[PDB]
Subunit: 492 residues, 4 copies
Amino acid sequence: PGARAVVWFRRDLRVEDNPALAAAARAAGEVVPAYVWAPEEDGAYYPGRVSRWWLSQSLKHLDASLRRLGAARLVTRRSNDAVAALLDLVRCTGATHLFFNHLYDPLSLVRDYRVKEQLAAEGIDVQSFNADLLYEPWEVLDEDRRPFTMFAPFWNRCLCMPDPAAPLLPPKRINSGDLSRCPWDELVFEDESERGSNALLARAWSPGWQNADKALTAFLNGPLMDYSVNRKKADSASTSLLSPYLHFGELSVRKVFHQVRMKQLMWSNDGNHAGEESCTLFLRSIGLREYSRYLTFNHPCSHEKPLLSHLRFFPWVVNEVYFKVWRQGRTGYPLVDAGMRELWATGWVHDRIRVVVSSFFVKVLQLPWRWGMKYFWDTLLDADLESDALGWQYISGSLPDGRELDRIDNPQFEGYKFDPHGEYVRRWLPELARLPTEWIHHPWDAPESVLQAAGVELGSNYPRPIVELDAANSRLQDALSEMWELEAASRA
Amino acid sequence: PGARAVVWFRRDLRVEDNPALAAAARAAGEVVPAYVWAPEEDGAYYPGRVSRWWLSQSLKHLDASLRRLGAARLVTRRSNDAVAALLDLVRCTGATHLFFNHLYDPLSLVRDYRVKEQLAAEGIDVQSFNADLLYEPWEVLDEDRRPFTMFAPFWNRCLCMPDPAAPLLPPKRINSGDLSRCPWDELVFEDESERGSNALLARAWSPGWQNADKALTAFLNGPLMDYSVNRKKADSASTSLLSPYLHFGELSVRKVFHQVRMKQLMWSNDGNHAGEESCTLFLRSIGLREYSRYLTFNHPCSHEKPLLSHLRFFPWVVNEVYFKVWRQGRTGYPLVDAGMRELWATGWVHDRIRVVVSSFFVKVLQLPWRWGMKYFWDTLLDADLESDALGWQYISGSLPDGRELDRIDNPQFEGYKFDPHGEYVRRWLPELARLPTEWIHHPWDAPESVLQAAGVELGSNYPRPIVELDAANSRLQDALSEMWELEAASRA
Amino acid sequence: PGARAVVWFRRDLRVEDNPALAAAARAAGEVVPAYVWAPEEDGAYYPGRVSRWWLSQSLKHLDASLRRLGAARLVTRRSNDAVAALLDLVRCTGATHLFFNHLYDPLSLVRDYRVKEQLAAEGIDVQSFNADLLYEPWEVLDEDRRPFTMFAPFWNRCLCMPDPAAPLLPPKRINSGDLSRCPWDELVFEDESERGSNALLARAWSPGWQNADKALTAFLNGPLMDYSVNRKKADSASTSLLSPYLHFGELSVRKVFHQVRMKQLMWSNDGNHAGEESCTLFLRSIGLREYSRYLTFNHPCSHEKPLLSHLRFFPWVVNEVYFKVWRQGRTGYPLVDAGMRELWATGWVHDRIRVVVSSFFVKVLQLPWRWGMKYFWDTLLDADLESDALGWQYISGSLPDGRELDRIDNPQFEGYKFDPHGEYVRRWLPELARLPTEWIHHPWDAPESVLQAAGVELGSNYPRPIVELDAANSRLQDALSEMWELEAASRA
Amino acid sequence: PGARAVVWFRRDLRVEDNPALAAAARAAGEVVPAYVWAPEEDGAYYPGRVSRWWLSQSLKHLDASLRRLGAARLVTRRSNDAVAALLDLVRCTGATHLFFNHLYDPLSLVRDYRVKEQLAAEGIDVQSFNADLLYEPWEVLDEDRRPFTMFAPFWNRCLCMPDPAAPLLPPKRINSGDLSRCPWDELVFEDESERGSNALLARAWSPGWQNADKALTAFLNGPLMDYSVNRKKADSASTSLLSPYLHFGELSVRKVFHQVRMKQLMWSNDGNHAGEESCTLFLRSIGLREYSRYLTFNHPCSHEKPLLSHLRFFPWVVNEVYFKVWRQGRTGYPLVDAGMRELWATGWVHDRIRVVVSSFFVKVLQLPWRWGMKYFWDTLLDADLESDALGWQYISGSLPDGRELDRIDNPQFEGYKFDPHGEYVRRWLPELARLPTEWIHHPWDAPESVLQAAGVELGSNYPRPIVELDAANSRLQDALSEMWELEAASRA
Ligand SMILES: Cc1cc2nc3c(=O)[nH]c(=O)nc-3n(C[C@H](O)[C@H](O)[C@H](O)COP(=O)(O)OP(=O)(O)OC[C@H]3O[C@@H](n4cnc5c(N)ncnc54)[C@H](O)[C@@H]3O)c2cc1C
């Protein structure tokens, strides 16, 4: 009751199960809540074109959700320096207590300490807890006090760890203080050119604290049960579609764990024997994110010692027109192309068809992986540098469990794994909507009298394949050899 | 991992959010679970005819749910002495740790201590926690350290108390020990005469750990939202139908609180302004049970100083044929009679039409309230002596907030409150299915040429009213006067 | 275009597939439509208490349906003489052409001729066609030019007869003439006492031209398919519920034949092999009505030579209290009693449980069948003297295919045929809602310690059986013997 | 019963409401049914690539539907001469009576007479009736005995004509004769190259006698009611999707008229005031087909005096690469291009977006209309030369009510009429899935900094517009002038 504590959140835009919210209305009795936007010294790089578009709309949905729970306001202050914003706030607000939530990424790994040291020097009682992750990366260890180099045992230990915390209920209702009229900077998240041509994201995606709580609750009832068989299939709504919601924290990662585990229970005693297997498998898929946070917290992943050091001595072509063809739906490889048409039509693509397009980048285009990550970063809603780094490691050699860099997936039966009747291609790629599915991911291989049976005439409708696959798969093996050849040269 | 702890539950038949289960598989690594049946020295009285029928079926649904989570068995041991059964068990099981769950009733208020003292003397580490109640009755107090004499402020304080514990998730999976073959007594819950004629309960009710978890989850989606308006209406599925499930603990009382409070959240930001009011009102209705546990823990309610002391000097007629007519659907009062036909057809009746039949017992029949409670006890599934005592206090004078003993409700517009179009009567009472609803709860008052317009001919179809209301409502006031007259006589 | 023809309908209240409507707006170009109410010389007897209640509401639904198709009015004229009403109309209307629809019953068999002879004498061109029946009773004959004495071959011939006429579409839209203000008598259909206590019929039934068109269309989709198995079961919505609609003509009897036969088609090629059998069986059930019209047209059934001549020399008890117990739910026989509670609660009962109550009248009560028919006539909505005569013949000896008069059905497994789990009894008869279903139709036979297991105490709840079955089944056989004994006496 | 009559159908593949079927099992008592395939002297031209694919599958669905109704067989005989096939049949079958159904097209206008003259000379009683059309083209006339030159009054008269015949019910069940083993030629409908790449038609369309009966019955319940507003909108399932079914006769054109008109009735009395307007409007849309049959029966439309005589002296460019771009989705005009991607992906496109692509052919490509019709003929399922001629007349000058040839529709607000939010484009044309809908049908006009806001880069993704619209709309007006200029030259 003493003063007005304040919470400042960045990737925990939710009012349910927000320890920071449950801490501020737990010492103080006046709680004003804030978000800051110092992007320049958020450091290169930024959040990307669409990761903004989402972020703006979440805030709106946080502001008018916040306002309802307790009429202040979401107080928007933009500055050159983050640390020197909460100081701008704390005098402004007239507050003695700043509470927020942890963030594990490198770019804000150090920021929190220097929002602690600079703030503790002003006797301000900065404190922050854990709502973004399920098992705190420093909470899990390795037989005697070491780390995990693979996924397998990190999860297998986590499984018979204890149960992680049930989600806290929201506060009853909260209240401001003087919205003095202290710091109302309206925020700029999108450039004015791509305002209109952004919003079609809203036709396929609907961001928000609320909208994410039902994003999950409508997954459990439906797509969950027959998920174990279909998680690989990309031609249907086979997956949670819940990842940007979980990126920004709009959905509590242990709300879900509680709910999933519950459904498993009911299904077991229901006698549904494939609901449990489906239900365990999902949990592992959430575990992948938990490991992502673990790996960046465990390994440097900062400046320089890069994530993909070990391709340092790799020779790839710096070709800026191959990349543009990749950027769009014109490579020649339909699986890659449907994915590529969807990413940039809608801002999300199935996991398994991320690998096929992201492998295709490094593997057969032999182009600098930095280029891919930026486009990914720029054009994805569910972009965390953390799990999207992990996804670039897995896919290209690195991770001891990640798949073989030396092997180029053959699209025809990597396409039967992920699109068996071939109707993923042909919701995005109707140019070839009619060529039968034997070789819908092949069109080159298939005979020239069948192409005409279904009006694909590569070079009018659907373009001939960039880099005819055989001779990149040669040249990767030579390229890998120079890697091996010149890493032992500078092992001297 | 050291030995085999054991849990013994009585009114907490559930595997989710069972601290006892989460305690035994938390010291020990072998967990066998048990239930005992010493009814003779469970003390007069028993659990009643149907409260058994439910109990048997729950166990079955606990045994084969227990078995699946971890194949032992539900170990059934019947004895003359309860205390001397766990000793029979602990040697048998070869166990060092007995954990169970609290029960607040008087009949087992003392038992737990003497399952502690006798068990602590054998160095056995008896311990037990809180899963049956939401706010522990000793956790709430009164300004300076006193108690609550009404409902109003007990809840109003509880509301801005803290949030009560989120429900614990079930254990992953558990395991026996040697089901030596140590104590398998098969249990007798129903007499063999009323076996067949019991089970129609199963057509309207379906007991079980599981069945209760979906009893709730199908309430939230449907009847919850438009509950604030309809909680009084008894002609539709206006209520949770969730009370026997919550009596035996099959549904966690703070599973529900979490879920309710959540729905309130989503509805508030949904803009549904009547979902919140509906959602708060339900919560109070759960609060009524919490107060029930509070009142019995607070006030003696034991041997003798009875719950309804203050009718001690009341003169009622000991008439055993009035009671039999009450027992069935033949009183003459249709509201009372539909309720009475339903209680004994199905084992549950709406709250608000419990008061009309339970008032009718004390008020116009002027019959010994003990008689009512036993039938209630004998014929209800959702029978706890605790809340069903509280419901007999409220209804007859006692509780400072309970309604006036001196006033006899007039059935005609107490029937419009609770059955406005009159279709509760006429699902149970079709003898008069056709007399229009102006006076469907009246039939006496209504004119003798209308009775014939709808073929009620009181004394063939639907019997003339026992004790024509006017002259019991006289005689209660005289009866109350002798109470007042002879309580001041023995205030000498 | 010449003048204003007029249509007058009595048991064809519908605007679709009404040849009379399609004839008047086919010579004339002005069409006014009318209904008359001469009940006194409609002849004893009347239409019964509820057959009115329906009739009033149909007219209302014809008047405002008529008005919409073409704003006149339904013109209501009540008179002592029917014939002298259309003369009152024709001058009034200023009309040259009166068209209506055939009615096959005896009471209006002669009326139509003397609405022809008296009207043809005034040079008025009376004409009328066929919309009430499917195969015109004079259209079907017997090998060489004879009649049918059983059902079996009447239908078997009708089956490979030709297809009967598809239903005509309604007129586009029609128009009056001067609603001069010529004959507006408002009509009296119900006595003012039983106005209010009639309408609960509206809760279970909803009469009307329109409401009947969807009464059918919602039958085909649902209850039709699994009708072949369930037509006998009375515990569910196993049947069309379409008979009063079809009595008054609100549903075209060959609209349905077309629709049924269509569904059979689609199901056959659907591969549904039980939809065809179900679909044929329904058709026979409609055939029963067609035969009814045939039998009254074929056999005198008029004044006197009564339908049940051959029980003329039968001795039954004239007891007016047995009949009153029958009238209500108090006989002692639950199957009979549920039916009896439903008839008079709602105005319709399943066919198969009509026989059990209507047999019970003649067979074990041995009471004058006239008494039953009047109550049936008075309390049924789907009352045509035509098919409800046929149903009294079939059930009591007469019809060569009707079941044996000498045999009294034993209620226990006539009740398993028609109510196998026993939940028909116990939606209407909840007094015994709890006694298990082994002997729910028996209660006498079942042991006195089970009655108490389920609180039936015959003589408080559910009354002991009138005429304990054995000794009526004796006495029918003696009664039948005196019939046989004294028919051969007056074969002298 | 005398002999085996035979029916031969060509564009009436249905067993319900097939007068030919109802005629053969009405003189004869043995009925064998047949279809012939003489395509060479069916005359140029053929039926097109997909009109076959449908036709094969219908037969299959007729053969095994025929077989079930009555086990013969559909007897498939292919010949050089049609007339000399039924002679091959009639001896073969040993039959005296050949009945079929009328076809109004020119190519078989004469065939029927010379399947009559050659067959009547062999004393064979050829006869055939009317099942393909609703009002027989010789049944409607013009004030005094003339014809109709516009649609408007042809329908307005037809409306207050009489009601056309209700649909006949199928036969009960029929039977062969000796399937001697007389003429079983298996039929070739598709070339073996385009077998596989044809069938995806089956994913969007499902042909068949049966499948068409439910194609309609699921239209009435849903899309019918809100059809009056949405018939123009092409972005949803706004229309019957019932036209190929109605082309081949699989759906009876007066089954539907009956059903539609019925729904109108129920909606009127339902009070739905927009169901009637919607229901009338559909009927007119069926009327368009009726007029089509009328126009070809009325006007020569044969050899030579072509349908589009009056563009005889029109100069268009014979350019075979403009046409190929049209053939596919690459014109530059998104509305045109989505349509063009759908036609050839799926074999059907909305009516209103047929005009925009078919106008675009004649109007801005200024290419020979013959070229369009063949592709239409080749790639449509719902291809009748009859109504698809009429649709080419209407769209290009001809029909006195058809729209102005001189005016080129401006795509931007012809696209708001037909695709208001722009989601038709972007189910077929996702290359531009993201450019906002202000100018999704414009992409040229819209500014070069917005193209980049949504990654359209015309010349990588979605190609720059063939013939930049302005200067075809110039050149049509010059082209029209030479028409006018050189028709008056040869009016000399
Ligand atoms: C004469 C009388 C007798 C009663 N006997 C019992 C009994 O034997 N067992 C029992 O659980 N409740 C009893 N109650 C309380 C209340 O009527 C029942 O909880 C109600 O019948 C349950 O219906 P429900 O499932 O729709 O509860 P809901 O309205 O759906 O809400 C669920 C919770 O409401 C609680 N509740 C609501 N009202 C009360 C109340 N007055 N007192 C205590 N709890 C309340 C119940 O514990 C229940 O768990 C009695 C009330 C009266 C007036």
